[PDB]
Subunit: 93 residues, 3 copies
């Protein structure tokens, strides 16, 4: 369901990066950026998995852990966007 | 959320934020600017993940357990490695621009 | 004061964690060796600054995810129960992030060295 859509997303990114006439270095940066997002999203899901296992009811530290994990994912997404934007502006510069 | 109003996250937050601003103004090529950003961004990501770990641990209980201390130590280790990676990154790249 | 004591304390925790992870597992020790070799090779390698960083950044990320996944397992094992679905799920997601980080590093080294022909 959700993991499939992310799998579709990252596959398209690889296809696009392969479709673009770019060098080895820039191609690595494009891929690795999206790869990092995958890593953070998986680790964040691991956090939420532990949280939902520990607590049966609501707790402050439980919501804190989820917010911090979701924040890390956001920072990762932003980092990927900035990376793609900078490189593409350079290639078509 | 309520995480933003903390002395620890303000200091770590501005340290990374300043580096991004500086890197955005530095006169270097694209791939260099990307690495300057991605390095300090990675540090922030690891710090947020590490902070999430500690939050989960404290959620468990106040009574100490060996795995509880191990979880925090391993988390701090990842943060350390991330900072080292950031320093080395900026050191190698800026050494050319600095001369 | 507070800023200096946090750096020292975090350095103490980090070194205590790196020590514990090195003592407990043999696979971790060999992994650290593989990383250290990669760092030295990339430093002595005749490539430009950007490639040198990428080779380093790859293996450094591997260790970070490894330590973070090991932190997850520590919390999971901390929890006391016979068996839970989210117990295996948490480690499954963590192990997935580890294998992704390793593969991405291997491919990076593969592509970069193949383009350098060295
Ligand atoms: C127009 C908004 C697109 C979506 C957001 C993309 C943000 C990208 C970059 C933010 C500024 C940081 C880097 C900008 C800069 O200093 O130079 C970039 C340029 O040298 C690349 O060739
Ligand atoms: C440029 C290298 C950055 C770090 C790469 C990853 C290194 C990971 C682990 C290195 C060893 C961790 C600390 C273990 C150690 O040195 O001593 C353990 C010893 O006291 C008992 O066996
Ligand atoms: C080519 C490698 C150069 C050094 C790169 C970083 C290596 C990191 C750790 C290796 C040194 C730590 C080994 C253990 C050690 O010396 O400490 C002994 C321990 O009693 C201190 O608490």
């Amino acid at each position: 369901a959700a993991f499939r859509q992310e799998g579709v997303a990252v596959l398209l990114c690889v296809v696009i990066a392969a479709w673009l006439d770019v060098d080895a270095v820039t191609r690595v940066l494009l891929i690795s950026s999206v790869m990092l997002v995958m890593i953070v999203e998986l680790l964040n899901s691991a956090i939420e998995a532990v949280v939902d296992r520990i607590g049966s009811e609501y707790h402050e530290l439980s919501g804190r852990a989820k917010d911090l994990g979701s924040a890390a994912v956001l920072i990762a997404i932003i980092d990927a966007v900035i990376t793609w934007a900078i490189l593409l502006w350079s290639h078509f510069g």
